[PDB]
Design a binder for this molecule. Structure first.
Ligand code: ANP
Ligand code: ANP
Ligand code: MG
Ligand code: MG
Ligand code: ZN
Lengths: 461, 184, 164, 619
DNA sequence: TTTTTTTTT
């Protein structure tokens, strides 16, 4: 009750790449963008393809629905078939030419394949992770695959899952092993070991038959010019507030990110993620292996509605009127908020710096829509934080020293004004903050730095 | 031999002296235990209760019988009898209940055998506690509080509530309270 | 029916719509419609017991004229004498058991009594009783030629029963 | 052995005939059809119903529970295979039980080793929980060297199946080819454990309470949290243990759960729906409900109308740009002592679902909203989300705690930014509060704002404020005393004199004091409010014009004319209070539209709250 | 063990 005829599936996948199209905007013809991206990989202007499964689902191709369902249900296997079909397409495009050498592993592979010269031999001698040097990622937009962190359970292991959330923690990029290469002392043969998961065990004794029969006892030495590494990053992602049940606190999950999807996020961002849910190698621990990430903070192109404004000009009155149109009046206050949303220039004459941004204080009687205006400004600004006078300490505004109980270490943790860097912080109920909490912002509002000297830490942020 | 004893019991035990599986700790495997130590009535008891109820001077007799070693204090002893017996307890069709308990307070000089009166009520009451939490432990009983100059929800609602960092609960218990002060 | 009006009223406001015994009885079938009942009795697992002491044993058939695979059978008979209190009243008892007591049985037994002249002192009557007929209640209601009776007095001049 | 196989075939055949009888008298085939249409994977049976048709199975299902239960689940799978609907679920189908247990209804104290191997039903309070974790059941592997597919199954002592196997994860073929795991084809199950303790009403005095451990899998996981009062049905069993080939003889015991019942609300039938239609079509349903709310408290008619509006509630508006406008209603009572403020709070606590009660005497603002404990910890107003908070002794709270409420009462949010924690929390709820005035007793020679003694920013957040005075007046004193004594002399019609407590209309009404006018039963009140809460009325032009004129009149009215004095601030929030009260009144009519008839009643209630004549001591 | 920091009572 299983299908393992990989050649027919490869035929279906290649037919998708050949026959998906979009009409040209002038009507002059058709673009075949997926095979254009394949040719970009072939000429090495690219490193990854992002495939949309909904395009496969809505393509005008036989068995398209079945292919999309098979991809979604066993995504960890279909990645290999997509890589194989793209490799065959690359060789069909390239012909007898050679792809350019750009890095040391490319130089080693191009030199060694022709040292071997001086397809069965190639595929037996080299593992496919080393023969193929590009990335494949999947995406979905249909609401059938939308879930929370809370809903990902035992039925979702091995499946493609999509969700939306907030990033709590993120590590820096590290080198992660993908394929190790070893060489023997005595007989000068090579061993290739692919690595899966978070552990590997190195072999000790040489396996080559002449060395084994001669009992030459040659050790194996690992070499990092032939070994393959990849960018690795780790995140923790939290539930969004609308997703949580009534009277409940959000949950979190760990995410592993590889390759070109690294460095797309930092702490304090809201993201849309597609990935595969997997265990760690009878009760099991789990994580999410990210396939595609999108910042909703960020997302030469211009919209037509903006093009009309940019051609019109004299936009100042309309821009003032468009800030929170449910609130009646306060035209000059909206103009002040509009200026605070933009600000001036930074000046650095002769080493002396001057702040460029603008600070505004609002006061008024109760019931005059201060909180409504602050909420609209928080939605409008790209990077912004909201705090109240009672709910914040002078350490939660600036930065904190955290004592890890597991290790005993000390570290720094950035507060709201650090997370809002380059943007806007809104402070409600400003008169009800304590004096010894309020006096922390004196350095930030004029020098735009936070400087700390505590325990075993001394830095500037 | 399981569930035969409770902490505080005085016992004599016959058993085998064993070492637990070059140094071992000992234990005793028990072969025999020997212990060194309401709500039901007879027709004789019912007739005795009804004879006292049939007497005309029964209320005055009970008030006299409260604490005979301590002189005088006739109206205070009558009040303590009212505290012991209590009123009726009611629940109307809308669900709002009406209390049956009665509460009494004593003021003045710190002497004149106040603590001995509280100890007498502690001995006589079907359930009760004496003390200087403690408020919870007397469902259907009587609590005597000495040195009261050392809760409004507890007295009226028969419940206290809390909401501090990381906890919110309510503790509910029904009782009458007798309080002695030396003087809100 | 008002329940449909209630569901309609809930849907019209927009409130969510998710917010016979008659004891034991008999039945009568006339004419051409009998053939459906014949096929039903042929088919159903309702009448063919799949669990119990009568596992896979088909229903019983009974008749008073021979048929293929029919076996001829007879009721068990016995009798007793009772005497009491020095009276004239010695009593003589006859029993028939262990099968269906079909309607012809009582008719022939009346003739046995009247032929053997036990009625000759009609001032001393003879009585007859048939039991457990309530399990087949209804079989005598469809016509004026039948009757429900349970206990019967026989004389030579008449046969009597209660109003029932 | 072959006799055991024949007996198991007989038992499975008996259960299959019960499940798939040709004309099903117990309708379990239709329940199977419902189960497969809904995508669920276990079927609930009445043991009392099995007891009638197969008593020799039912009583044996308690003593010899394991074999009988395995046979029953096999019969369920065959009954499913006879359907024209397909078996989508990769885990098997399961059975839970309900009914009469008798001997095997137990507590954690009375579960002892005589019961091992039997089916039992137990009661208690959840005290711990593990997080849900996934557990391997079968593994599927592909052999790339040969194009064959290998499979393996796993078993454990905590599973009902007694069978055991090697439990080694396969890595190589029999021909020592390597293997690749198929994660999309391997099978896992959700798994959780918890513990239950004796109920505090049953544990004997002085001793510590006893406790029992529990295992739950599949759809039974993620159903409980600490503090839940539960009744749990499962098999009581024992688990051996080993260390270096030496075994201590003391083994551990668990309950393997089949079914869970919660002990800690609405119910309907078409007769009840007919009666709801009739009472809604009557002449003045809002006045009838307001009179019927709390009959054993004399007076307080306008406050009862306000509390009914609180229980119904307004409409939230979420606009096209994500902006939000508040729907909840907030009510404050200030007044003299012994005027039934706390009594009305306890009554609303009974009537409202999702309700919490606290006092300002013993509440911190941190515990009232949210706490850092490092972790984040919910407070009372977060726990009461889409619900009601009752706060007593509100004047005894500190202002440092009061200033923490200002965000919650308007925006419906709690925001925290302290060491290592930055989070929003939803706290959309209605506040009902009671207090005493500044001097402990109302001073008639000072103004109502002076007697209330709270700032305008806090006073503006209450939709309605009621000042309650205990005026000496011989007529009112006589009437109130007569009502109280009439409620105290009452006894039920079918009750003997020596006893002690250990349809639509009411029938005995001497306790209620109201002489002739009818009163609705509290159960009917609960049902009516439950249905009427879901009505979603819209506004109209006559209502809009009336509200807009009336708001300007209220703001521009001057009090030096009439010898009255102002009880509230008047801001733009009170306009929204008019809108909220209009929608709440329109809900009680089961109306789809808000009209002038609703807005006039809303204005009369608000104008009662806003102004008060000077006290007789000053006049 | 002793030391240093930030939230809570
Ligand atoms: N001019 C206005 N236009 C529209 N809505 C208004 C206006 N003035 C007040 N409101 C409403 O008044 C309510 C209270 O708004 P809010 O922003 O909390 O006032 P505030 O200035 O923050 N008062 P406070 O926070 O106690 O100092 C909201 O529902 C607003 O929609
Ligand atoms: N019609 C009535 N009006 C007023 N009080 C009544 C009435 N009927 C009964 N009572 C009694 O009066 C008391 C009501 O006061 P209660 O609610 O307990 O405290 P409170 O009103 O909040 N005063 P306080 O807590 O000291 O501020 C109870 O003992 C009631 O039984
Ligand atoms: Mg505000
Ligand atoms: Mg009170
Ligand atoms: Zn070698």
């Amino acid at each position: 009750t299983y299908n393992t005829d990989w050649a027919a599936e490869k035929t279906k996948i290649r037919s998708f790449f050949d026959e998906y199209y979009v009409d040209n905007e002038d009507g002059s013809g058709k673009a075949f963008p997926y095979r254009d991206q394949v040719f970009e990989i072939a000429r090495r202007d690219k490193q990854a393809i992002v495939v949309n499964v909904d395009h496969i689902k809505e393509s005008d191709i036989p068995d398209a629905l079945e292919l999309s369902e098979a991809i979604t249900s066993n995504t960890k296997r279909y990645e290999v078939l997509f890589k194989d079909t793209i490799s065959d397409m690359i060789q069909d495009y390239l012909g007898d030419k050679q792809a350019p050498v750009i890095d040391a592993l490319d130089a080693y592979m191009f030199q060694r394949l022709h040292m071997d010269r001086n397809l069965q031999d190639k595929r037996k001698k080299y593992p496919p992770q080393l023969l193929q040097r590009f990335e494949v990622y999947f995406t979905t937009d249909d609401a059938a695959h939308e879930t929370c962190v809370r809903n990902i359970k035992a039925t979702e292991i091995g499946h493609l899952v999509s969700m939306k959330g907030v990033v709590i923690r993120a590590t820096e990029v590290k080198p992660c092993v993908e394929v190790m290469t070893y060489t023997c002392d005595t007989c000068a043969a090579e061993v290739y070991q692919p690595v899966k998961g978070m552990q590997f065990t190195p072999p000790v004794n040489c396996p080559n038959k002449e060395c084994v029969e001669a009992k030459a006892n040659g050790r194996l030495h690992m070499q990092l010019r032939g070994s393959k590494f990849v960018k690795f990053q780790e995140l923790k992602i939290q539930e969004l507030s609308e997703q949580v049940p009534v009277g409940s606190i959000p949950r979190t999950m760990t995410v592993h990110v590889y390759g070109e999807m690294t460095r797309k996020c930092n702490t304090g961002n809201v993201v849309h993620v597609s990935g595969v849910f997997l265990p760690i190698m009878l009760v099991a621990d789990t994580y999410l292996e990210a396939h595609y990430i999108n910042n909703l903070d960020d997302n030469g192109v211009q919209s037509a509605e903006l093009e009309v404004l940019r051609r019109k000009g004299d936009n100042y009155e309309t821009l003032a009127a468009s800030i929170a149109p449910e609130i009646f009046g306060h035209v000059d206050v909206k103009k002040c908020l509009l200026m605070a949303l933009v600000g001036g220039n930074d000046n650095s004459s002769n080493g002396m710096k001057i702040r460029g941004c603008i600070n505004v204080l609002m006061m008024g009687d109760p019931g005059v829509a201060k909180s409504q205006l602050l909420g609209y400004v928080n939605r409008l600004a790209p990077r912004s934080q909201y705090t109240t006078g009672r709910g914040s300490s002078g350490v939660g505004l600036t930065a904190a020293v955290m004592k890890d109980p597991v290790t005993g270490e000390m570290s720094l943790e950035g507060g709201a004004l650090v997370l809002a860097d380059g943007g806007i912080c809104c402070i409600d109920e400003f008169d009800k903050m304590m004096d010894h909490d309020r006096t922390a912002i004196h350095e930030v509002m004029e020098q735009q730095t936070i400087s700390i000297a505590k325990a075993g830490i001394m830095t500037t942020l | 031999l399981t569930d035969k004893v409770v902490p505080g019991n005085r016992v004599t035990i016959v058993g085998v002296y064993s070492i637990k599986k070059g140094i071992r700790t000992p234990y005793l495997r028990v072969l025999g235990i020997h212990m060194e130590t309401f709500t039901t009535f007879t027709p004789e008891e019912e007739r005795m209760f009804k004879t006292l109820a049939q007497r005309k001077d029964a209320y005055e007799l009970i008030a006299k019988s409260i604490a005979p070693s301590i002189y005088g204090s006739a109206d205070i002893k009558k009040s303590i009898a009212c505290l012991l017996f209590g009123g009726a307890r009611k629940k109307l069709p809308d669900g709002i209940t009406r209390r049956g308990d009665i509460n009494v307070l004593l003021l003045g000089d710190p002497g004149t055998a106040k603590s001995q009166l509280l100890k007498f009520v502690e001995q006589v009451s079907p359930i009760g506690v004496y003390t200087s939490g403690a408020m919870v432990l007397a469902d259907g009983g009587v609590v005597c509080i000495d040195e009261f100059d050392k809760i409004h929800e507890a007295m009226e609602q028969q419940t206290i509530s809390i909401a501090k960092a990381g906890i919110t609960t309510t503790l509910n218990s029904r009782c009458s309270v007798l309080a002695a002060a030396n003087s809100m | 029916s008002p329940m449909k009006l209630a569901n309609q009223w809930l849907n019209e406001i927009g409130v969510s719509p998710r917010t016979d015994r008659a004891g034991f009885q008999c039945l009568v079938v006339h004419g051409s419609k009998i053939h459906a009942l014949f096929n039903a009795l042929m088919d159903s697992d309702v009448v063919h017991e799949k669990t119990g002491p009568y596992t896979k044993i088909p229903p019983t058939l009974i008749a008073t004229s021979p048929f293929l695979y029919g076996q001829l059978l007879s009721l068990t008979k016995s009798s007793n004498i009772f005497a009491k209190a020095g009276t004239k009243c010695t009593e003589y008892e006859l029993k028939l058991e262990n099968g269906p007591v079909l309607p012809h049985c009582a008719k022939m037994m009346t003739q046995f009594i009247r032929s053997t002249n036990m009625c000759s002192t009609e001032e001393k009557p003879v009585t007859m009783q048939v039991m457990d007929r309530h399990t087949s209640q209804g079989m005598s209601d469809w016509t004026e030629t039948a009757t429900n009776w349970n206990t019967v007095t026989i004389a030579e001049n008449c046969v009597k029963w209660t109003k029932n | 052995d072959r006799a055991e196989d024949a007996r198991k075939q007989e038992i499975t055949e008996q259960y299959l005939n019960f499940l798939d009888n040709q004309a099903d008298t117990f309708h379990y085939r239709q329940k199977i059809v419902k189960m497969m249409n809904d995508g669920e994977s276990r079927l609930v049976m009445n043991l009392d119903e099995i007891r009638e048709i197969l008593p020799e199975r039912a009583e044996g299902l308690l003593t010899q529970s394991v074999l009988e239960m395995n046979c029953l689940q096999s019969a369920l799978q065959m009954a499913i295979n006879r359907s024209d609907v397909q078996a989508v679920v990769k885990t098997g189908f399961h059975v839970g039980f309900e009914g009469t247990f008798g001997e095997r209804h137990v507590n954690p104290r009375t579960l002892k080793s005589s019961y091992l191997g039997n089916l039992v039903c137990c009661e208690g309070i959840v005290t711990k929980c593990s997080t849900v974790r996934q557990k391997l059941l079968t593994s599927v592997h592909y052999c790339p060297a040969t194009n064959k597919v290998l499979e393996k199954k796993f078993a454990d002592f905590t599973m009902l199946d007694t069978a055991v196997t090697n439990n080694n994860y396969p890595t190589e073929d029999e021909n020592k080819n390597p293997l690749e795991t198929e994660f999309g084809h391997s099978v896992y199950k959700d798994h959780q454990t918890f513990t239950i303790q004796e109920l505090p009403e049953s544990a004997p005095a002085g001793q510590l309470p006893r406790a029992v451990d529990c295992v739950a899998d599949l759809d039974l996981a993620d159903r409980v949290k600490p503090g839940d009062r539960v009744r749990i049905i499962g098999v009581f069993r024992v688990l051996p243990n080993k260390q270096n080939g030496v075994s201590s003889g003391s083994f551990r015991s668990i309950i393997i759960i089949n079914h869970i019942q919660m002990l800690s609300i609405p119910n309907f039938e078409p007769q009840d729906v007919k009666d709801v239609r009739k009472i809604s079509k009557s002449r003045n349903p809002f006045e009838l409900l307001a009179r019927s709310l709390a009959p054993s408290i004399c007076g307080h008619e306008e406050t009862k109308k306000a509390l009914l509006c609180l229980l119904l509630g307004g409409m939230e508006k979420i606009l096209n740009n994500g902006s939000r406008l508040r729907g909840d209603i907030n009510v404050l009572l200030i007044g003299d002592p012994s005027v039934a403020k706390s009594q009305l709070l306890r009554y609303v606590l009974r009537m409202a679902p999702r309700a919490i009660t606290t006092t300002g005497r013993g509440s911190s603002g941190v515990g009232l909203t949210a706490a850092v404990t490092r972790r984040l910890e919910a407070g009372a107003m977060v726990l009461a989300d889409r619900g009601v908070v009752c706060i007593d002794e509100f004047d005894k709270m500190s202002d440092i705690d009061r200033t923490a409420i200002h965000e919650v009462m308007e925006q419906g949010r709690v925001t925290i930014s302290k060491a290592g924690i930055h989070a929003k929390l939803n706290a959309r709820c209605s506040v009902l509060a009671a207090a005493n005035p500044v001097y402990g007793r109302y001073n008639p020679f000072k103004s109502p704002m002076e007697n209330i003694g709270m700032q305008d920013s806090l006073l503006s957040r209450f939709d309605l404020i009621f000042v309650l005075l205990d005026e000496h007046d011989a007529d009112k004193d006589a009437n109130v005393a007569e009502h109280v004594l009439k409620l105290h002399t009452y006894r039920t019609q079918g009750e003997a004199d020596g006893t002690v407590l250990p349809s639509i209309y009411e029938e005995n009404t001497q306790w209620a004091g109201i002489q002739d006018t009818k009163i609705l039963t509290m159960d009917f009140m609960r049902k009516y409010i439950h249905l009427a809460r879901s009505v979603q009325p819209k506004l109209t032009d006559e209502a809009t014009e009336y509200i807009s004129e009336v708001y300007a009149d209220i703001r521009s009215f001057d009090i030096t004319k009439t010898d009255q004095e102002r009880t509230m601030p008047v801001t733009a929030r009170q306009l929204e209070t008019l809108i909220r009260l209009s929608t709440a009144i329109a809900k009680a009519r089961f109306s789809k539209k808000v009209e002038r008839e609703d807005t006039e009643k809303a204005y009369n209630l608000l104008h009662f709250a806003c102004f008060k004549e000077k006290p007789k001591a000053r006049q």
